[PDB]
Amino acid sequence: KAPSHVPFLLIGGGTAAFAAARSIRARDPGARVLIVSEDPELPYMRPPLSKELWFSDDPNVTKTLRFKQKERSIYFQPPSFYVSAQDLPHIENGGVAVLTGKKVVQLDVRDNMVKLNDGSQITYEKCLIATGGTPRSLSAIDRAGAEVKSRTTLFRKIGDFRSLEKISREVKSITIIGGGFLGSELACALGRKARALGTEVIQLFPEKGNMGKILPEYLSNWTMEKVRREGVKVMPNAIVQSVGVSSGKLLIKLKDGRKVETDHIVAAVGLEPNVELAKTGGLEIDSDFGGFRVNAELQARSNIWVAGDAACFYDIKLGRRRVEHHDHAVVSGRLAGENMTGAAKPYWHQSMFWSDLGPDVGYEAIGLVDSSLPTVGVFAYGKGVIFYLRDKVVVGIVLWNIFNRMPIARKIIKDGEQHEDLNEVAKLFNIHVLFQ
Ligand SMILES: Cc1cc2nc3c(=O)[nH]c(=O)nc-3n(C[C@H](O)[C@H](O)[C@H](O)COP(=O)(O)OP(=O)(O)OC[C@H]3O[C@@H](n4cnc5c(N)ncnc54)[C@H](O)[C@@H]3O)c2cc1C
Ligand SMILES: Cc1cc(N)c2cc(F)ccc2n1
Predict the structure, then answer these.
(1) Ligand 1 site, residue 164, Cβ cutoff 6 A
(2) Where do the H-state alpha helices sit in 263-401?
(3) Which atom of ligand 2 is nearest to the CA of 365?
(4) Is 346 helix (H, G, I), strand (E, B) or coil?
């Protein structure tokens, strides 16, 4: 199936890879691009797996994988957009092929060659590593035994959505471990499903409130109350000590003495970059942020770039970073595709992210957003803007229930001005003052 040589080889078939393939085809007409994906699915976007796909009025949404934004599919393109790998060398004006169900297990940088899990070898001229990451798991779950492990979900892929959606219709109690984006969005989604069926949803995490690492405490606490009003039993300040099976149910023991009985656990406790290929490829990994260490142009070696969740890159403006946003995979993937066709451009356009936690909670963010940084919040906590500061300069912004204003927030961070009155800057977001 796979040819012996391809001009453009993209390792991994996710958001960053697809954005790169589209970018290469737009900058190099007739280009021949091969995506190698270990998943059986064609490239698709993940955000709907924790949001729109759970709020669809169509009960066949699990099969169609379409959602209302305007209806559209979770796949970036239908199969008709792609050509087969076997035909990729011969088709006139080239195309984009995806070799599904295949994993790159060896990378030879000196010879511009990869080896697949089935023994196949492919040489390339330009290569992109866009392997993303794998969900982390709790140490308490790893030591819990096979039964507990079989009743614990790591949420990332289409299969995880389908398996958890089926569970929410079969069991009475689901527990989410994790207070970040994924845990909070799944809590609101499972909470909506539970209100109609009369079932239970629990979310526990060690922080004082949802999104405690991202939002200031006062806004994290406000968010926790909104999640609770979606039908979720939220347990902050919860550290899992052990997990076992008791009378057929899962028993979660917390360090503080509390105990939670439930039927199924969803672990949403972060992501580990997929850097397996750094060993054979002799590629540098970043010990501080994780991931493949690349420069401002997302380049690792002469013919190898890295994009997406797995790329630790140099931001000429904000310093060295690694970002795990959908839009960042798109932006970095497209940038890598342009540099794979001679652009030599540095990461410059700042990617944004967003989150929706029910009807009354939606926010957008950009730049360095971290609750450890000093923050200034200007609210009208219905609507407002939170500025994240470093050396008296705005390095990140969170827009709370403010939409269609991201270009303004992007300009403020790019300009790097020293603002003496952030209340005037809040007027740019139609806000007419909390500190942390
Ligand atoms: C449920 C969910 C909801 C999200 N919601 C949001 C949101 O609302 N807003 C937001 O900004 N971000 C969101 N994100 C984050 C966003 O989806 C990620 O930042 C984005 O998918 C990262 O793109 P990627 O290409 O770097 O990685 P991935 O999408 O993970 O793609 C990597 C692909 O490469 C495959 N692969 C790995 N190693 C190999 C190998 N050796 N050989 C072959 N294939 C390999 C992996 O199987 C995977 O298929 C969400 C993520 C999830 C999981
Ligand atoms: C930056 C970001 C934003 C989100 N809304 C998000 C949601 C998820 F479910 C998982 C990861 C996420 N990462």
Answers:
(1) no
(2) 277-281, 326-339
(3) 1
(4) coil
Q: What is the dihedral of CA 262, 263, 269, 272, to 10 degrees?
A: 160
CA distance 224 to 238: 14
- Distance between CA atoms of residues 398 and 363, nearest Å: 7
Q: What are the structural domains of the chain?
A: 5-42+77-134+272-339 (3.50.50.60), 137-269 (3.50.50.60), 361-435 (3.30.390.30)
State how far the alpha carbon of 40 is from the alpha carbons of 20, 33, 191, 286, in Å. 20, 18, 30, 30
Q: Are 109 and 283 in contact (CB under 8 A)?
A: yes
**Which tokens go with 336?**
């890598």
Ligand 2: residue whose CA is nearest its atom 12: 181
Closest residue by Cα to atom 6, ligand 1, is 47
In this structure, the strands spanning 304-306 and 299-301 are antiparallel
Q: Is 16 annotated as a binding residue?
A: yes
- CA of 341 from ligand 2 middle (Å) equals 31
* Sequential DSSP letters for 160-229: HHHHHHHHTTT-SEEEEE--SHHHHHHHHHHHHHHHHHT-EEEEE-SSSSTTTTTS-HHHHHHHHHHHHT
* Protein residue whose Cα sits closest to atom 2 of ligand 2: 325
- Which single residue is written with the structure tokens 């079969």? 170
Residue 109 assigned ligand-binding role: no
Phi, psi of 404 (to 5 degrees): 65, 30
To the question of whether residue 326 is assigned a binding role by annotation, the answer is yes
Resolution of the model in angstroms: 2.4
* 420 in a known ligand binding site: no
Technique behind this structure?
X-ray
Contact predicate 239/256, CB 8 Å: yes
- With b meaning 16 or more CB within 10 Å and e meaning fewer, what string describes 196-210? eeebbbbbbbbbebb
Q: Which ligand is nearest to the CA of 105?
A: 1
Q: What is the distance between the alpha carbons of residues 266 and 368, in angstroms, rounded to a whole number?
A: 28
Atom of ligand 1 nearest to the CA of 352: 11
Residues with CB under 6 A from ligand 2: 50, 181-182, 185, 325, 353, 355
For ligand 1, atom 52, name the residue with the nearest CA.
Answer: 46
Q: Is 354 annotated as a binding residue?
A: yes
